């Protein structure tokens, strides 16, 4: 299987450097070109540069020439991007695209002779502010949570900073009927978010629903079991 995995989200201070990893699975990082593309949230895609795996020349965009360095660890199959002297304009999601050779593996729809596969993305926030872990509370199902036989439950991820928080359900086993809402910014300057899911109320007694929240910048992994109670 052709699998591209990237570093967790990171928060860096202005003037500092940021490093993100692109690890390739299922195919050697040889004769496979690596590209780095930056996406400002809710903005356009900016191609930072390309790196040739078999030592070909690596071209950097005029914008990021002085600040970006690209390197490869062929042994671990991981490419690295490093952007220095970070400025607030650099807060964005960073992607590495494996645009080379033949992927070979299907990966759901088979990439085959095609070259491009894209990383999941690494959110990088440039800010002097203090990192704060999220607070996870349950949104318990109730008679106030049921409609036409279906009940609704969830998790409230409150007061976290910076932005990237990932929520999964039953370790990823539950995705049908799931809604992870975009985060809101409290006056405090901290983000809050909610993730809900609709399930058969008849099942409420037999099934176990657990929400998995990861806030990589804070280094927090929480698993909160949502169980029905009260009103």
């Amino acid at each position: 299987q052709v699998r591209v995995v990237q570093s967790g989200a990171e928060v860096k201070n202005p003037g500092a450097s940021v490093k993100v990893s692109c690890k390739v699975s299922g195919y050697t990082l040889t004769e496979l070109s690596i590209h780095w593309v930056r996406q400002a949230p809710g903005n356009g895609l900016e191609w930072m540069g390309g790196f040739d795996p078999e030592d070909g020349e690596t071209i950097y965009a005029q914008k990021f020439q002085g600040r970006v360095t690209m390197t490869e660890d062929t042994s671990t199959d991981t490419a690295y991007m490093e952007l220095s002297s970070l400025r607030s304009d650099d807060t964005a999601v960073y992607y590495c695209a494996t645009a080379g050779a033949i992927t070979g593996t299907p990966r759901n729809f088979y990439y085959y002779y095609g070259m491009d596969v894209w990383g999941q993305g690494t959110t990088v926030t440039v800010s002097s502010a203090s990192t704060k872990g999220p607070s996870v509370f349950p949104l318990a199902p109730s008679s106030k949570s049921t409609s036409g036989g279906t009940a609704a439950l969830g998790c409230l991820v409150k007061d976290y900073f910076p932005e990237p928080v990932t929520v999964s359900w039953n370790s990823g086993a539950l995705t049908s009927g799931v809604h992870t809402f975009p985060a809101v910014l409290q006056s405090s300057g901290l983000y809050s978010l909610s993730s809900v899911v609709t399930v058969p109320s008849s099942s409420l007694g037999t099934q176990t629903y657990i929400c998995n929240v990861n806030h990589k910048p804070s280094n927090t992994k929480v698993d909160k079991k949502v169980e029905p109670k009260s009103c």
């Binding site: 356009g44 895609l45 900016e46 191609w47 071209i59 965009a61 005029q62 992607y95 299907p106 759901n108 729809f109 088979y110 990439y111 085959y112 002779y113 095609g114 491009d116 894209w118 990383g119 999941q120 993305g121 607070s135 509370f137 349950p138 949104l139 318990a140 109730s142 106030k144 949570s145 049921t146 409609s147 609704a152 969830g154 409230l156 409150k158 809604h179 809402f181 975009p182 985060a183 809101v184 910014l185 409290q186 809050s192 978010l193 909610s194 809900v196 609709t198 009260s230 009103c231």
Partner: protein
């Protein structure tokens, strides 16, 4: 740097109906060899971009036949014969002919669907949160089609202003609907000083404003 601009700004289209996005380049996309390297990528909400077309007509493997691409010189067009709920998203056009590679500003493809009234759910504050000192109440508006929706937090029949924050989902890739989440946050003290917490929702699919309420009961 070669410029890439997508002619369609935003597009509300009926299901099963065709669609076509245009890309315009300031300079010729023909390379020094004699080819033209133009790519089309689709990004679903909160997802990495997936490459659908290369050159202009070359369709990537595993890419639906519904997608097609045709361009000439500086103009290029991506066409979806029929539109499905899974196509919602943002379409971008990339050029690999000249360094630095360029991307279009993107174009959002939305979906016209029949009206759907939301389902309203009210969630009270957890005891753990009360221990932390605060109290958040959440009103959930699930699977409503018209994006426009109204939410009103009422505490003991008293309408509130402020202390509320809400978010709307990106268009569903299955339903093509929308979901809303509104949280009213109060201090533990404010929360205990009252009895009934309710949220009244008004939407087009709703004949009359639906109100979901509860009594504190100390939680």
């Amino acid at each position: 740097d070669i410029v890439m601009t997508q002619t369609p700004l935003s597009s509300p289209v009926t299901l099963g109906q065709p669609a076509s996005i245009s890309c315009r380049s300031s300079q010729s996309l023909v390379h020094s060899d004699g080819n033209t390297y133009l790519s089309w990528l689709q990004q679903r909400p909160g997802q990495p971009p997936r490459l659908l077309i290369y050159k202009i007509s070359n369709r990537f493997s595993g890419v639906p036949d519904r997608f097609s691409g045709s361009g000439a010189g500086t103009d290029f067009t991506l066409k979806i014969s029929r539109v499905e709920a899974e196509d919602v998203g943002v379409y971008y056009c990339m050029q690999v002919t000249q360094f630095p590679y360029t991307f279009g500003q993107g174009t959002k493809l939305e979906i016209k669907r029949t009206v759907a009234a939301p389902s309203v759910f009210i969630f009270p504050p957890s005891d753990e949160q009360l221990k932390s000192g605060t109290a958040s109440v959440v009103c959930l508006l699930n699977n409503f089609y018209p994006r426009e929706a109204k939410v009103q937090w009422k505490v003991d029949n008293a309408l509130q202003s402020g202390n509320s924050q809400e978010s709307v989902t990106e268009q569903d890739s299955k339903d093509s609907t929308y979901s809303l989440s509104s949280t009213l946050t109060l201090s533990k003290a404010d929360y205990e000083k009252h009895k009934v917490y309710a949220c009244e929702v008004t939407h087009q699919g709703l004949s009359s404003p639906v109100t979901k309420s509860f009594n504190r009961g100390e939680c």
